[PDB]
Amino acid sequence: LVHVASVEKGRSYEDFQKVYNAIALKLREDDEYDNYIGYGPVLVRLAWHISGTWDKHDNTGGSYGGTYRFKKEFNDPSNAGLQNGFKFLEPIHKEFPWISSGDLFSLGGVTAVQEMQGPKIPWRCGRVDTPEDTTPDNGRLPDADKDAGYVRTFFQRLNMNDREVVALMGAHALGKTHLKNSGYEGPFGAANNVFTNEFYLNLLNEDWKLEKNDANNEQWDSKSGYMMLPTDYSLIQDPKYLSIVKEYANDQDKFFKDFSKAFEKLLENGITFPKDAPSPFIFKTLEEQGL
Numbered sequence: 001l002v003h004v005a006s007v008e009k010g011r012s013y014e015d016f017q018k019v020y021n022a023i024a025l026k027l028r029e030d031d032e033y034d035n036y037i038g039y040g041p042v043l044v045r046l047a048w049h050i051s052g053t054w055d056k057h058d059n060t061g062g063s064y065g066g067t068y069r070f071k072k073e074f075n076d077p078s079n080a081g082l083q084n085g086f087k088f089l090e091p092i093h094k095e096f097p098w099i100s101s102g103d104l105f106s107l108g109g110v111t112a113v114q115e116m117q118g119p120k121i122p123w124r125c126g127r128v129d130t131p132e133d134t135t136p137d138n139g140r141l142p143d144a145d146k147d148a149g150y151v152r153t154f155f156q157r158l159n160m161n162d163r164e165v166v167a168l169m170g171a172h173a174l175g176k177t178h179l180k181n182s183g184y185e186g187p188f189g190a191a192n193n194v195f196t197n198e199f200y201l202n203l204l205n206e207d208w209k210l211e212k213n214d215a216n217n218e219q220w221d222s223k224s225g226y227m228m229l230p231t232d233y234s235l236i237q238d239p240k241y242l243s244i245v246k247e248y249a250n251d252q253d254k255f256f257k258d259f260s261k262a263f264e265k266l267l268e269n270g271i272t273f274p275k276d277a278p279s280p281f282i283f284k285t286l287e288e289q290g291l
């Protein structure tokens with residue numbers, strides 16, 4: 001397929017900054033969600049899930065079409081719990097009905113990161129809502145009960161190399177696992193809603209014990225009370241991945257830079273941007289705007 005980015009007719013930067021501002025202000029206000037963690041993490045996951053169904057081989061899936069809106073994609077068992085991110089964005093959508101769904105879901109991901117003190121992620125508008133029929137079948141999102149090899153291979157379908165996968169994985173410093181959603185339970189770290197290189201440090205410095213949970217799945221549990229999925233732990237089992245985790249554990253800055261690039265790339269997979277398209281936008285945070 002060929003998915004060409006088409007700007008929302010008549011809209012510019014300022015129009016988008018306003019959508020961002022609305023998502024941001026609503027993140028600030030609804031902070032009771034999930035025991036005071038807020039919706040930041042779920043939105044990050046939301047943007048990654050809508051973009052992870054991409055397949056470099058035939059161009060299907062990816063964020064373009066906003067297919068997550070259709071039943072089949074919405075009801076994907078791997079997307080269990082995402083419904084909450086979606087409800088959070090509905091009123092936003094009703095307030096700016098001109099934005100395409102794929103642009104809104106991805107933007108929310110960008111806003112969450114930034115408002116959570118993460119790096120600035122350049123973003124581009126242009127996604128266009130496609131028909132129900134372009135909805136990818138379930139099964140394209142990864143399983144968490146595997147190893148590094150699995151990880152490597154899987155990521156390959158999205159065009160990501162070792163550095164890219166390690167980077168992207170640091171998102172697992174945010175939020176937690178929920179038994180009813182995935183069969184996993186427990187916060188990944190301590191900050192939970194502040195974006196840092198925590199993930200890497202936790203991986204190198206905790207005393208993890210392999211245990212089974214009430215869902216009967218194995219998970220790595222730490223004495224401080226955190227958790228790591230088998231796929232997460234495999235990052236320290238692979239020699240190539242391990243040196244990357246060390247780098248990140250040593251330089252938040254480098255991580256932020258790498259994550260940023262990678263994040264954008266992830267959200268743009270499958271999209272063709274015409275030569276006249278506006279450059280990517282860099283939104284100001286509520287803080288930078290004094291709001």
Ligand code: HEM
Nearest residue numbers: 041045048081142143144168171174175176177178181182
């Ligand atoms: C092999 C790769 C991955 C696997 C198998 C995976 C699996 C999981 C699992 C099973 C959950 C818990 C969901 C719940 O029960 O509510 C989760 C949570 C999370 N995922 Fe990942 N994940 C991976 C990749 C990613 C990446 C690439 C991103 C973004 C860059 C990310 C962002 C997060 C976030 C922020 C949450 C926490 C959500 C919340 O607090 O509701 N994950 N992931």
